[PDB]
């Protein structure tokens, strides 16, 4: 199947409380495998999945070197944007950055990304062609012009189409057991009486991997999208994911309702009924 590698970076100013906070996390698909936290004692890129613990001091030292540089860049960036938007030194502000690459089921380069937000809004993004930039406002055009002159898109395109996907493929092979696995959802329904004339039927999906899943209810085969309570997919904490979907079923109508589960780990999609 298809895969991704993504890095996510958060930098938050903390005026009068010292240095900005800087958190970096890296993922393959839905599996986190590295982290850096500026506030933590080690001051090192650190492993968070067991397959990357095998990599060795050259790897760990080079990822530490790069993430430390980024922490310092984003310190300057916080001051630069404060200047761009004429903001006071009093307020806390947030810079986020994400980049990464996607490969298709052939494991060849499919798509690459590199984008930023300031205070929760789109600031600048590399467009799909890996050649040009989308700039939100007037501040982001200043950044855009800087990056145009410094040929930042060209450097990124080479990374995203070459290095990024070469290391993704290396991770997928070295971490095959964890990263090329699917855990099928373990499923069940519960039934709880609301009152005398209706009941909640809740369809559960547990311990699945990856996070992508479709969980829907039908009544006589008609989709109940409007009338289903659906929670966000949520992590279990052990690398698997959970989701439920519920409907309110009037008296004697349980047999009309079917829950439908689609997930990569199932040999065929499931149709579950309370009966």
């Amino acid at each position: 199947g298809s895969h991704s590698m993504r890095y996510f970076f958060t930098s938050v100013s903390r005026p009068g409380r010292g240095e900005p906070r800087f958190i970096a996390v890296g993922y393959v698909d839905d599996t986190q495998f590295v982290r850096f936290d500026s506030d933590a004692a080690s001051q090192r890129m650190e492993p968070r999945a067991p397959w990357i613990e095998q990599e060795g001091p050259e790897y760990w030292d080079g990822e530490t070197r790069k993430v430390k540089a980024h922490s310092q860049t984003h310190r300057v960036d916080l001051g630069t944007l404060r200047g761009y938007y004429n903001q006071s030194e009093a307020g806390s502000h947030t810079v986020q950055r994400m980049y990464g690459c996607d490969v298709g089921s052939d494991w060849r380069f499919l798509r690459g990304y590199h984008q930023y937000a300031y205070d929760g809004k789109d600031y600048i993004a590399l467009k799909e062609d890996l050649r040009s930039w989308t700039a939100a406002d007037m501040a982001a055009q200043t950044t855009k012009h800087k990056w145009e002159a410094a040929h930042v898109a060209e450097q990124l395109r080479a990374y995203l189409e070459g290095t990024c996907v070469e290391w993704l493929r290396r991770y997928l092979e070295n971490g095959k057991e964890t990263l090329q696995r699917t855990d099928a959802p373990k499923t069940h329904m519960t039934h709880h009486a609301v009152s005398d004339h209706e009941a909640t039927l809740r369809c559960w999906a547990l311990s699945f991997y990856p996070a992508e899943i479709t969980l829907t209810w039908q009544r006589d085969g008609e989709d109940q999208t409007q009338d289903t309570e659906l929670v966000e997919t949520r992590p279990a904490g052990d690398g698997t994911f959970q989701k439920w979907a519920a409907v309110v079923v009037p008296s004697g109508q349980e047999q009309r309702y079917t829950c439908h589960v689609q997930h990569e780990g199932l040999p065929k999609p499931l149709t579950l009924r309370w009966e």
């Binding site: 890095y7 970076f9 890296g26 790897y59 990822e63 790069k66 993430v67 540089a69 980024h70 860049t73 984003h74 300057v76 960036d77 630069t80 944007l81 761009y84 810079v95 950055r97 980049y99 590199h114 930023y116 600031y123 600048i124 950044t143 800087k146 990056w147 410094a150 930042v152 450097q155 990124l156 990374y159 290095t163 990024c164 290391w167």
Partner: peptide, 9 residues
């Protein structure tokens, strides 16, 4: 494996 720089905004 990270990209080497964060380019200045």
């Amino acid at each position: 494996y990270m990209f080497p720089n964060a380019p200045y905004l």
